[PDB]
Design a binder for this molecule. Structure first.
Ligand code: NAG
Lengths: 48, 24
């Protein structure tokens, strides 16, 4: 469920937040996303 | 047979260290 505060457990990556659609350019091997501060930003759905 | 000539690498041989998407 998108656009709602939920606790996600994506492939063992625990956390909390709001998730929705995006327009990244994830390369085939890419799995995660971060920033210059090294914090998990975007996750690829394992079953989607 | 084969040779063993030496050349320069220049800028070459850089890979993605991890599988973490990054931008800007
Ligand atoms: C996940 O498995 C189901 C059941 O076989 C399948 O219908 C679906 O396409 C699969 N999805 C991915 C991303 O592999």
């Amino acid at each position: 469920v998108k656009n709602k505060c939920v606790n996600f457990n994506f492939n063992g990556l625990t956390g909390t937040g709001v998730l929705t659609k995006s327009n990244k350019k994830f390369l085939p091997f890419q799995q995660f996303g971060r920033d210059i501060v090294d914090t998990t930003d975007a996750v690829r759905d394992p079953q989607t | 047979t084969t040779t063993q000539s030496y050349t320069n690498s220049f800028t070459r041989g850089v890979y993605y260290p991890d599988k973490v998407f990054r931008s800007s």
